[PDB]
Design a protein around this nucleic acid. Structure first.
Ligand SMILES: [Mg+2]
Ligand SMILES: [Mg+2]
Ligand SMILES: [Mg+2]
Ligand SMILES: [Mg+2]
Ligand SMILES: [Zn+2]
Lengths: 214, 154, 181, 127, 81
RNA sequence: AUUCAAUUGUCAGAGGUGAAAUUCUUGGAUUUAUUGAAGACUAACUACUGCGAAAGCAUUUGCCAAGGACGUUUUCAUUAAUCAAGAACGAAAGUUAGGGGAUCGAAGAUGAUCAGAUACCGUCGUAGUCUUAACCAUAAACUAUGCCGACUAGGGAUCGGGUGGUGUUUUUUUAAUGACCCACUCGGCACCUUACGAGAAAUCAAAGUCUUUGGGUUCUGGGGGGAGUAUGGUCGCAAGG
RNA sequence: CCGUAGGUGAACCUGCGGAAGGAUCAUUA
């Protein structure tokens, strides 16, 4: 009988201060009667948006970024980093039938006490002088590149915290380090970290999250 | 269930003339060492005396219910012959601890000890007891377990 | 009040894209009144609209459907049929989704849906008002639901390993009470 | 500027779901099935039922005032097929036809790395 | 190719084929007379030396075994035979 | 990914279908979102391919021993080739006794239906599927082609190794390599043309070097059924071989 | 069709693993 549209209350979320365009997203809570229940309802909310729409670039640069809401500031919501992914059609186009695919994985504890998982993908190029219609790589080559990706990813995430991880995700510094550090092993193409998982969340802080907002 | 309708009715008749399919008539007249042997063979061979006349493919078979009915409960005997006849080629010990057979059997046992009030231990069968091993003890206690379903008599 | 969609260009079809693009764009630009921009480097096609164009919001979805059609092997006469009609839609399906086949079993299933000189493929386009393109492991049928539904029944007969003669008999049966009604 | 919605299209062989809420899956706004819009059981997954159902979802989104919307489309996924059926395509045609603004179109189908056994057996499942 | 000399092949095409498929079987190896500059002495090293041959006075690895041919040390001279 | 559990939102369906029908949904079903648990599995990358005696073998990393190929102005000097007896392995399904039992699912329980286009369909589902200890020894176990040795055609490739290049690229300042190119070279997986030759023909670099009939050796067949039956022996708990 | 297992059956169906002794069109490098 009663309409929930008469009851529900229009809220709003905002990005942290790492990114450029803060004004994204408009969320919603059924009831404002119990504020603790509303706060616990928005605590488990994970908003997935495009990174390019979050960065305002008109080219939709195939990266979805998914973000977790934590704190309330008067119908406005603080939002924290949770993870990154691609669109699945990017992976469907992206896998070639005549090259060798490398998956590299590393288990990560961070400097800011997060537990993380990083999946990086590398490939095999044609050179500018090729006659071969296929460019496969030997297994010892593949093991060497996987060793190099594990070392670069491990030292890169250990030398930095979450804000620097996000600040090095956007200009593709990490795969540039891969490109010039693996150029002595094999020619590599189309390198990106595909997908970011949080695994452990530490003891909940307050001032660090508004410092990320500030 | 074709012979089940005329095995347990009140006021049993004099004779029973009927035509069925011939292979069920082989199941009512199956020797215990056969692959044609089944549960319904035992059901007729100690509840309903039966022989084959008038081969017709179909078969006529003649049934007579024993008016001194032997005091055997049909539910427990039917259930045990079902759970050892479905696993005909298997043996009997490991076949009872199946997945859900090993729930419904001790449900039947707990209703069986509901009027007995036997204390169910914390030892209960995963190592040496009534859900797992005392079943093996009581099939060792009788003529079953190692002798398969195509060898055990009444 | 602009709107742009982004779509992916296969590598197997970019050479007929640059071969017959001169026949692709002016019918949709003239009759359907849209704007197209390429990105040949990043395999992307920009289908954009403008308030200086005609107000027709569904034909932008239709134009993305034409390039989604051309993504999956489809010629230009089926693009003319997709221009003129609305009941005609697109489908993919996998060889492994009916029956788990491997290698030469997959090759013989592709041979069964293909046939000698494509004749069972010809028999399934002409009798059902469908259009057939075979990928490595994908089957593609255009059309309406009464048409593509009996196309489904035929192709899951054929990829199950039923002989093509029973396919022809059931095909002319369903075509007979198709054109009967 | 505007408010974007988060749309879901679930395309089986036998119905279609057009199901939308706001960001992060907070509380569902509009909710239709294929069975409620045509009472004929042969036409549960018809494109006519798909367009009328998505038109009623668009009317619901217009009366709550959401203009922009972001959509992902999917099949059942898993052991069954990957790309959506044509009821989803007609739903896309209807939501674009409705005059509602569209934000993003992608394919979040739940794709296994390595699947389990399907429900057909060795021989096959379809007819 | 009905007629050709199997007795006197052309020497450009004769060492062009395999080691064992010649008219008389010959090796395709040689010996290297190596001079590391630090001690100035003649050491005769096989071209496919399959072990770490050091110099007899300095502990300099003259050649390392790498598959077919042994790679010589850098900044180090060599002669045939 | 699937299934199940917990939390979350919302309202008449979800399910399955030539078609319907059963199943469970105010204790809010399907679906949406946040987690957790279980066991299998290793997709796309995947062929123009790799390894192993065969069956078979696709995540990453570490350890354990093994193997082919190549290089070798190393070592032994006939130590070899084929195989009754005997022995090792042997897909799936099956068998014993354990652990696990997510999905699938012969048996069974259930619904059906409506027609001679027709029951394939559904929902629970036990065994099993997975693993450990021991059995079992069969397949369209197929290249429907015994093993070793020599000769009789090339070329486009490719995989592993090696040789050479005042060859390319990768720069840092020239190298070094790594990757790529060329000319080869062995040793594998394959292709395309022929016919000298074979065959009944399809076709074949072996199915040729066979009436101009002999490189060495192991097994099998003698019109079709009766029949892999009877019987005897042998192994196996049995199914069975 | 073959192997194995099961319900049966007047025939025959079903579970798991194999084989083609079964019919590659179009497109591209
Ligand atoms: Mg022998
Ligand atoms: Mg045999
Ligand atoms: Mg004879
Ligand atoms: Mg024959
Ligand atoms: Zn020296």
């Amino acid at each position: 009988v009663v309409d929930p549209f008469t009851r529900k209350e229009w809220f709003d979320i905002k990005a942290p201060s790492t990114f450029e365009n803060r004004n994204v997203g408009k969320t919603l809570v059924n009831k404002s009667t119990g504020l603790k229940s509303a706060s616990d309802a928005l605590k488990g909310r994970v908003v997935e948006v495009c990174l390019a729409d979050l960065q305002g670039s008109e080219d939709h640069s195939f990266r979805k970024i998914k973000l977790r809401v934590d704190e309330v500031q008067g119908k406005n919501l603080l939002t924290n980093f949770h993870g990154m992914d691609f669109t699945t059609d990017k992976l469907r186009s992206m896998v070639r039938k005549w090259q060798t695919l490398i998956e590299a994985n590393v288990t990560v504890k961070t400097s800011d006490d997060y537990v993380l998982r990083i999946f990086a993908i590398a490939f095999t190029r044609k050179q500018a002088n090729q006659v071969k219609r296929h460019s496969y790589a030997q297994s010892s080559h593949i093991r060497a590149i996987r060793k190099v990706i594990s070392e670069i990813l491990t030292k890169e995430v250990q030398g930095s915290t979450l804000a620097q991880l996000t600040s090095k995700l956007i200009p593709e510094v990490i795969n540039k380090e891969i490109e010039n550090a693996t150029k002595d092993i094999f020619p590599l193409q189309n390198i990106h970290v595909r997908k970011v998982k949080l695994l452990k969340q530490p003891k909940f802080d307050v001032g660090a999250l508004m410092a990320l907002h500030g | 269930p074709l012979v089940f309708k005329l095995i347990n009715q009140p006021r049993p008749p004099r004779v029973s003339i009927l035509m069925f399919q011939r292979e069920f008539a082989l199941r009512l007249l199956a020797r215990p060492g056969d692959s044609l042997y089944c549960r319904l063979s035992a059901n007729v061979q100690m509840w309903a005396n039966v022989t084959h006349i008038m081969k017709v493919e179909s078969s006529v078979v003649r049934l007579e219910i024993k008016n001194p009915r032997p005091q055997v409960d049909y539910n427990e005997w039917d259930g045990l012959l079902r759970i050892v006849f479905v696993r005909k080629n298997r043996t009997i010990s490991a076949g009872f601890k199946s997945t859900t057979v090993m729930d419904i059997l001790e449900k039947n046992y707990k209703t069986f000890l509901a009027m007995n009030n036997e204390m169910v231990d914390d030892t209960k069968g995963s190592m040496h007891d009534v859900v797992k091993e005392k079943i093996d003890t009581v099939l060792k206690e009788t003529d079953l377990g190692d002798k398969r379903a195509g060898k055990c008599d009444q | 009040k602009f709107e742009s969609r982004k779509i992916m260009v296969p590598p197997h079809r970019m050479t007929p894209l640059r071969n017959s693009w001169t026949k692709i764009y002016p019918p949709l630009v003239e009759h359907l009144k849209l704007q197209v921009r390429m990105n040949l480097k990043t395999k992307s096609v920009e289908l954009r609209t403008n308030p200086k164009f005609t107000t027709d919001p569904g034909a932008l979805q239709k134009g993305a459907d034409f390039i989604k059609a051309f993504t999956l092997g489809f010629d230009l006469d089926d693009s003319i049929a997709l221009l003129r009609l609305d009941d005609l839609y697109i489908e993919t399906f996998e060889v492994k989704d009916v029956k788990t086949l491997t290698g030469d079993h997959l090759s013989r299933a592709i041979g069964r849906i293909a046939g000698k000189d494509g004749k069972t493929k010809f028999a399934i386009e002409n009798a059902t008002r469908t259009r057939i393109v075979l990928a490595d492991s994908k089957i593609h049928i255009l059309g309406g639901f009464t048409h593509i539904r009996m196309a489904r029944e035929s192709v899951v007969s054929l990829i199950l390993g039923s002989p093509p003669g029973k396919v022809y008999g059931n095909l002319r049966t369903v075509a007979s009470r198709l054109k009967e009604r | 500027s505007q408010v974007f919605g988060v749309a879901r299209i679930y395309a089986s062989f036998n119905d279609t779901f057009v199901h939308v809420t706001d960001l992060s899956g907070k509380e569902t706004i509009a909710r239709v099935t294929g069975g409620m819009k045509v009472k004929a059981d042969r036409d549960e997954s018809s494109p006519y039922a798909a367009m009328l159902a998505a038109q009623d979802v668009a009317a619901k989104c217009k009366e709550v005032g959401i203009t922009a919307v972001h959509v992902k489309i999917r099949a059942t996924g898993g052991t069954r097929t990957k790309t959506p059926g044509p009821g989803g395509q007609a739903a896309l045609r209807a939501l674009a036809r409705s005059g509602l603004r569209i934000g993003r179109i992608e394919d979040v189908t739940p794709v296994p790395s390595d699947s389990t056994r399907k429900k057909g057996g060795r021989r096959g499942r379809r007819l | 190719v009905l007629v050709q000399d199997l007795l006197h092949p052309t020497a450009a095409s004769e060492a062009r084929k395999h080691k064992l498929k010649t008219l008389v079987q010959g090796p395709r190896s040689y010996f290297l007379d190596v001079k590391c500059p630090g001690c100035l002495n003649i050491t005769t090293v096989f071209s496919h030396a399959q072990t770490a041959v050091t110099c007899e006075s300095c502990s300099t690895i003259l050649c390392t075994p790498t598959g077919g041919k042994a790679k010589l040390s850098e900044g180090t001279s060599f002669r045939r035979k």
